[PDB]
Design a protein around this motif. Sequence first.
Motif, PDB file in Angstrom:
ATOM      1  N   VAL C 116       0.870  -1.111   0.109  1.00  0.00           N
ATOM      2  CA  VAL C 116       0.013   0.141  -0.012  1.00  0.00           C
ATOM      3  C   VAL C 116       0.972   1.211  -0.125  1.00  0.00           C
ATOM      4  O   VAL C 116       0.334   2.284  -0.466  1.00  0.00           O
ATOM      5  N   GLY C 117       2.237   1.159   0.651  1.00  0.00           N
ATOM      6  CA  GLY C 117       2.850   2.378   0.629  1.00  0.00           C
ATOM      7  C   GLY C 117       3.467   2.721  -0.759  1.00  0.00           C
ATOM      8  O   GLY C 117       4.432   3.786  -0.791  1.00  0.00           O
ATOM      9  N   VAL C 118       3.623   2.054  -1.690  1.00  0.00           N
ATOM     10  CA  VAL C 118       4.452   1.972  -2.859  1.00  0.00           C
ATOM     11  C   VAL C 118       3.707   3.463  -3.411  1.00  0.00           C
ATOM     12  O   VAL C 118       2.563   3.712  -3.815  1.00  0.00           O
ATOM     13  N   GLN C 119       4.692   4.579  -3.686  1.00  0.00           N
ATOM     14  CA  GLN C 119       4.208   5.769  -4.459  1.00  0.00           C
ATOM     15  C   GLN C 119       4.236   5.369  -5.926  1.00  0.00           C
ATOM     16  O   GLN C 119       5.311   5.104  -6.543  1.00  0.00           O
ATOM     17  N   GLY C 120       2.893   5.613  -6.404  1.00  0.00           N
ATOM     18  CA  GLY C 120       2.847   5.521  -7.976  1.00  0.00           C
ATOM     19  C   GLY C 120       2.669   3.901  -8.191  1.00  0.00           C
ATOM     20  O   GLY C 120       2.004   3.137  -7.427  1.00  0.00           O
ATOM     21  N   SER C 121       3.566   3.623  -9.356  1.00  0.00           N
ATOM     22  CA  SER C 121       3.186   2.192  -9.512  1.00  0.00           C
ATOM     23  C   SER C 121       4.245   1.255  -9.066  1.00  0.00           C
ATOM     24  O   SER C 121       5.562   1.840  -8.829  1.00  0.00           O
ATOM     25  N   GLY C 122       4.315   0.140  -8.758  1.00  0.00           N
ATOM     26  CA  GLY C 122       5.128  -1.035  -8.342  1.00  0.00           C
ATOM     27  C   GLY C 122       4.719  -2.271  -7.759  1.00  0.00           C
ATOM     28  O   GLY C 122       3.523  -2.587  -8.124  1.00  0.00           O
ATOM     29  N   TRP C 123       5.589  -2.977  -7.052  1.00  0.00           N
ATOM     30  CA  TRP C 123       5.156  -4.339  -6.375  1.00  0.00           C
ATOM     31  C   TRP C 123       5.616  -4.574  -5.135  1.00  0.00           C
ATOM     32  O   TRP C 123       6.676  -3.873  -4.522  1.00  0.00           O
ATOM     33  N   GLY C 124       4.870  -5.117  -4.138  1.00  0.00           N
ATOM     34  CA  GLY C 124       5.367  -5.772  -2.724  1.00  0.00           C
ATOM     35  C   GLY C 124       5.818  -6.857  -2.899  1.00  0.00           C
ATOM     36  O   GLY C 124       5.289  -7.767  -3.553  1.00  0.00           O
ATOM     37  N   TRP C 125       6.927  -7.371  -2.236  1.00  0.00           N
ATOM     38  CA  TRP C 125       7.376  -8.723  -2.453  1.00  0.00           C
ATOM     39  C   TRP C 125       8.073  -9.199  -1.185  1.00  0.00           C
ATOM     40  O   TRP C 125       8.391  -8.806  -0.386  1.00  0.00           O
ATOM     41  N   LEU C 126       7.664 -10.669  -0.933  1.00  0.00           N
ATOM     42  CA  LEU C 126       8.126 -11.404  -0.054  1.00  0.00           C
ATOM     43  C   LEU C 126       9.299 -12.281  -0.618  1.00  0.00           C
ATOM     44  O   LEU C 126       9.032 -12.741  -1.728  1.00  0.00           O
ATOM     45  N   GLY C 151      18.755  -8.555  -5.514  1.00  0.00           N
ATOM     46  CA  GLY C 151      19.353  -9.794  -5.085  1.00  0.00           C
ATOM     47  C   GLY C 151      18.637 -10.806  -4.331  1.00  0.00           C
ATOM     48  O   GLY C 151      19.007 -12.011  -4.482  1.00  0.00           O
ATOM     49  N   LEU C 152      17.262 -10.157  -3.681  1.00  0.00           N
ATOM     50  CA  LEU C 152      16.614 -11.025  -3.357  1.00  0.00           C
ATOM     51  C   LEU C 152      15.760 -12.263  -4.146  1.00  0.00           C
ATOM     52  O   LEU C 152      15.527 -11.891  -5.312  1.00  0.00           O
ATOM     53  N   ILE C 153      15.527 -13.331  -3.761  1.00  0.00           N
ATOM     54  CA  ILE C 153      14.752 -14.580  -4.511  1.00  0.00           C
ATOM     55  C   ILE C 153      13.262 -14.066  -4.318  1.00  0.00           C
ATOM     56  O   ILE C 153      13.105 -14.294  -3.311  1.00  0.00           O
ATOM     57  N   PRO C 154      12.746 -13.786  -5.410  1.00  0.00           N
ATOM     58  CA  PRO C 154      11.155 -13.556  -5.198  1.00  0.00           C
ATOM     59  C   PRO C 154      10.268 -14.841  -4.785  1.00  0.00           C
ATOM     60  O   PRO C 154      10.578 -15.887  -5.268  1.00  0.00           O
ATOM     61  N   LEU C 155       9.509 -14.814  -3.930  1.00  0.00           N
ATOM     62  CA  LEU C 155       8.606 -15.822  -3.275  1.00  0.00           C
ATOM     63  C   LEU C 155       7.119 -15.510  -3.550  1.00  0.00           C
ATOM     64  O   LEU C 155       6.343 -16.548  -4.173  1.00  0.00           O
ATOM     65  N   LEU C 156       6.949 -14.495  -3.022  1.00  0.00           N
ATOM     66  CA  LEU C 156       5.101 -13.907  -3.699  1.00  0.00           C
ATOM     67  C   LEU C 156       5.456 -12.477  -4.077  1.00  0.00           C
ATOM     68  O   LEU C 156       5.872 -11.800  -3.146  1.00  0.00           O
ATOM     69  N   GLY C 157       4.800 -12.250  -4.895  1.00  0.00           N
ATOM     70  CA  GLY C 157       4.544 -10.718  -5.474  1.00  0.00           C
ATOM     71  C   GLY C 157       3.154 -10.399  -5.576  1.00  0.00           C
ATOM     72  O   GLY C 157       2.338 -11.105  -5.901  1.00  0.00           O
TER      73      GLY C 157
END
Lengths: 196, 196, 196, 196
Positions: C116-126, C151-157
């Motif tokens: 929710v805090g993403v300013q503009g367009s984007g993604w939240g990731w675990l 460098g983080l491995i994406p698990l959930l986006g």
Amino acid sequence: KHSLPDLPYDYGALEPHINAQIMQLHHSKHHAAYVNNLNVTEEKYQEALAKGDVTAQIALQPALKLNGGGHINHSIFWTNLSPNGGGEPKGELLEAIKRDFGSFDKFKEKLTAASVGVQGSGWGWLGFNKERGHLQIAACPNQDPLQGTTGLIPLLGIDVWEHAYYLQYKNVRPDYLKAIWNVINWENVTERYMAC
Amino acid sequence: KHSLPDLPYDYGALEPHINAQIMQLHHSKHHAAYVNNLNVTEEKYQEALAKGDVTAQIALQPALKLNGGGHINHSIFWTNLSPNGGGEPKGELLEAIKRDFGSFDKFKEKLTAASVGVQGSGWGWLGFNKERGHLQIAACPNQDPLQGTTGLIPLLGIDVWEHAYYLQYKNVRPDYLKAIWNVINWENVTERYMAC
Amino acid sequence: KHSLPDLPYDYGALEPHINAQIMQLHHSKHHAAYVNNLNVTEEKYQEALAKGDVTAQIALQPALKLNGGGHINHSIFWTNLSPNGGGEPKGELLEAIKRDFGSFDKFKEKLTAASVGVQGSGWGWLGFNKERGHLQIAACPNQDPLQGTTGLIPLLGIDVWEHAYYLQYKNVRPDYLKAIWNVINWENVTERYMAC
Amino acid sequence: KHSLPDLPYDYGALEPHINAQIMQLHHSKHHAAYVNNLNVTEEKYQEALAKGDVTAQIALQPALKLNGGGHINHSIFWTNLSPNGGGEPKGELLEAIKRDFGSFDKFKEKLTAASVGVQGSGWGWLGFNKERGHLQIAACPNQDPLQGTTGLIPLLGIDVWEHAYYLQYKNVRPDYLKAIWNVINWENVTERYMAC
Ligand SMILES: [Mn+2]
Ligand SMILES: [Mn+2]
Ligand SMILES: [Mn+2]
Ligand SMILES: [Mn+2]
């Protein structure tokens, strides 16, 4: 309103690791300019804010971050160094380091790589993450301050702007970092750690 | 201290080019939130500035730029549109445009390409360069305001955040831009131009 | 060379949490465009690289990141969702989550705030931090991919570009995030976790 | 594949404006490193591109821009300087300058302000805008190259990374810029101008 803090030691106190010329220029010229420009900028900002000028407030952000960050970063830096520093830390800090980095040497390794990897001007930092409760390494560009831009509490900072080491180590940033470990004030890093 | 300006026309006044639902959400929801968040942020900032907290001032920059810029950008945007707009401008503005872009149609072309080319959220702008004395096209990311970040004086802005057109034109940004030309308030763009 | 992957379920399979119209547009329009633009960009790049044109290689970076990232992000996203998802994860993943976030609900909380805090367009990731061996939450702007930039491995986006939810939840991003938890494919997140 | 160009003059040829030590370090150490790192990076990139690894391509962007830009920027820089330079340009270039900046001295003024205003590491540039057909001043951070990031054709560049002048002018960037005007190779800037 803001002022240039006095150095807790003589300009040549860190020889031969960091020569007196660098310390004198770094403190009396570079840091002094940031403090002076910061006061001028905060003043203009107080003014823009009073009459609700949003445009002026936004135009002043780069100057406030650069100079405000410059003052914050160097102020911490002076306290992070000591003619009586060097060696390894002890107590809880040493444990926190082994815990989060495996060993003191792996920590040195990490922080050195982060500092040397800064593209252009910047800082390498050992900070404390309040959320996770762990130590964390981060690098910041130019004078962007650690806490204000990442939320991490600064414990130890290494200035890698070329004016930090060029006169003495020229282009060999790795030599500069190898030498700085001999003057790190672990007693100061420890109390910053205990404070948070 | 800052407030949501009333729209100079009814929400459905721009139909069928921009439907009433978008205008209502865009004004009463999106812009309203920016104004409210701006006042909260300026207040915290007044506070940080009073006690010389540089760290807090820097941490608040993203929120002030986003919300402050959001208020500025949308406020100009509403005045840039009119149910009686459309067509082409006349007078000195039209000459300035032919002069700097060759023709009105080449100008439309340029501004459209800049607006459509925004990666993510942003704005396409026709601004005035005080230094050179010429008109200039620029695109800004998210809510970064034109004047505060580039120094250009804003004359006409086109909002290309997806909330601007998605409900009506879905993913076809080009259809949105083709339609918006029919409601541009050239009389307002002209007076902004004459003012600088 | 790169291709649009087929969805592992029907467009309306995630109703009522995410309606069929969004899924259809999101997949067949948005993702398709990224794949097509990616192939065009990689081709131009192959060409610039062959004749050692450094200038062209650098000019193409924004387009490669946006489209390449767009393809990567959405490809993972489709597999992160399932008409049979929802609930809570089990096994080692659940333990890793309690370990690193305290509880599953605190984790949901964190990831929701970041999204929710993403300013503009984007993604939240675990994501998974290989260095520390812990789970980590991060937010990325526009289509910047997690691994390639952090460098983080994406698990959930979680996609928070407005085209992700506007047609259904309008400006209320929090409603969108509350609903998406009901269709998270934990079996897929788990195997991505076990893989790294 | 890429190589370190030989200097068209001796290292001490620009004395006393820029001493021999700086020129030797700047060329044989700084530029050499960029060329070597560029070839290593292009090679890894060729590899990532061959197997369609988008993630690797994106992770390599910072290194390619820094080193590729470093090579491009310094290569132009060497040709922009000459032991026989200095004075003012003549012909069409001088006219273009009066036209776009009012006078040669106002141009010097502008370019100097842009160069001195660079926060951190960067370059000040006099470039040509193909679209408008006018000369334009721009500043770029770190090693970001002019053409690749702005589209402007580079005519004259001034390196303001501290390694450019620190050994000789220390923190006084303005002294460095005042001195560099005495060695600008206008004959080279002129032919770059005539070429575009
Ligand atoms: Mn410094
Ligand atoms: Mn908007
Ligand atoms: Mn999407
Ligand atoms: Mn250089």
